[PDB]
Amino acid sequence: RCERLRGAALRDVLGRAQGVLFDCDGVLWNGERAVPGAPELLERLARAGKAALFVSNNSRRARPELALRFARLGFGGLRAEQLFSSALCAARLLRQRLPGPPDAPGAVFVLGGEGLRAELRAAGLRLAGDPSAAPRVRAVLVGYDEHFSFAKLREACAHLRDPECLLVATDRDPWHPLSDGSRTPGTGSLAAAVETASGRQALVVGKPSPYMFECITENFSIDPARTLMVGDRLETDILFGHRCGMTTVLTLTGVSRLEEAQAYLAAGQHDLVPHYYVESIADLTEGLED
Amino acid sequence: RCERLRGAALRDVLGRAQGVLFDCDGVLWNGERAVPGAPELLERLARAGKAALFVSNNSRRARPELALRFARLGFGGLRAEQLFSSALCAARLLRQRLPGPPDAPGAVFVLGGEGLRAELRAAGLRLAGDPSAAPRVRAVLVGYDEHFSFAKLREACAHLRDPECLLVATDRDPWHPLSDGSRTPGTGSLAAAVETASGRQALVVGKPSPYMFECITENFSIDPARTLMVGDRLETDILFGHRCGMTTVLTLTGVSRLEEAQAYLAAGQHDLVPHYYVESIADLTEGLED
Ligand SMILES: [Mg+2]
Ligand SMILES: [Mg+2]
């Protein structure tokens, strides 16, 4: 129904909620700059005894470095266990799913940087291109790869020739905004290249995939009916929220515009329609008030 | 109806035809090896006074080097004017369509090698990355780019931010077979990456695009109702043949299997169903016989 969230309703929605899931970029901050009032919403949520957790499709950085951004931008006492990234969760799914014999479960061919590789190793996954004592490659992982090349695409497809080799994508985010006003290509753009050349569909880890929620709920009980999902991207965070059965809030500090959300409601595409919208998440603090 | 082409029917089909359009790879040859009897079909067609022309989605080589392959593999007196490649035709469409003011029609940002660039220049197109006297980039061309990188993908999308900048793809061939038994990623795989990151649909030049036929018929009159289209790929050559209104022949020396064609006929997908099939194009010579 895309309701602007204020007043009596806002107080009710937040009061009933046991917890809040926050996308990060476009939500808490944009580039170098925190959304004013965002850290203090988080303080007021802790103080109201409502759980905050964070869901990021970022596969560029391992958790401990991704956590750094919080403090850097004025988000104080957040513990790394509150942060879930597609990198963390890709590492976890591969451990859960690697198809090979117990004695040698398989190597993962990874398209991604050093942060992503760390997470994978941190989960006990063997990587192709790590020094040998070559091991059979049993999954291809496509992450945000700034050094993506045709040669890598060619290698990924050679591995995927074996149909028992998994294809995994961290996310399908097509592109990402930068401070200046330019976009960077996303993982979804690289996944599309790998899918097309190999003739395969990827297993997607990050939002809007329901697996990202399975990853959050390994370490925490979350009743999605009592949880809010807050994000800036309709096709990522809002869609995620719907598939998980959460009340969705669109914040207008990021990628999607209100026009796009109103378009989808008129088209009846209810999965990409937010329950609520705030101009920025500093607008939710008012509904917690002492 | 997917009829195996022989006997009385074969003699009739070839007798009525004024001309034949041949895909090259998987049709005339595979890798280093000519299909036996293929050069002599071509001799017998000339001798029957039936026109042969050649249609290739190849954007790797400029015409004069692409022509070399013919003689190299025992295809004698073929003149370069009989050969149409997506590279040649991409060069032509860009000249026809570049959106800029008469005094400076615009530079083309190209994802492709030295062969492709030559064709583009040979048509009088200005290239980004050629030395300056930067010129405004008014088209992005995605060809077969063996040196494709994330950095190039990022640059192509920056150009495409301007919506008056054209997106052009030479072809959408996802992958290509090699002698050994491995595939190389196709242009379609790189086009999918560029499309996804930029949020745009490419203008496609090569088969199955109807534009490839417009490109052939600039230099030649072809009555498609009296022309045969022969290829190995259902989704490329057969589909092309259908959209152009030609009688389509599948040859079994290349990518598509007869099973795949029979599947599509049962699914009623008539555009990807060949009129006829031969095991190899050496089987058509018999229907010309003196
Ligand atoms: Mg976001
Ligand atoms: Mg072919």
Explain what this protein looks like in three dimensions.
It is classed as hydrolase. Keywords: phosphatase, chronophin, HAD family, hydrolase, magnesium, metal-binding, pyridoxal phosphate. It forms a dimeric assembly. The entry is titled "crystal structure of human pyridoxal 5'-phosphate phosphatase". The structure is a homodimer of 290-residue chains. By secondary structure, chain A is of the alpha/beta class. Chain A folds into 2 domains: 169 residues, HAD superfamily/HAD-like (Rossmann fold, 3-Layer(aba) Sandwich), CATH 3.40.50; 121 residues, 3-Layer(aba) Sandwich (Rossmann fold), CATH 3.40.50.1000. Chain A is 34% helix and 20% strand. Chain A has a 7-stranded parallel β-sheet, with helices on both faces. A 5-stranded parallel β-sheet of chain A has the order 8-7-9-10-13. Chain A has a two-stranded antiparallel ribbon with strand order 3-4. In chain A, strand 5, helix 3 and strand 6 form a beta-alpha-beta unit. Chain A is globular and about 60 Å long. At the A-B interface, helix 6, strand 12 and helix 7 of A face helix 6, strand 12 and helix 7 of B. The complex binds magnesium ion (2 copies). One magnesium ion (MG) binds next to loops of chain A. One magnesium ion binds next to loops of chain A.
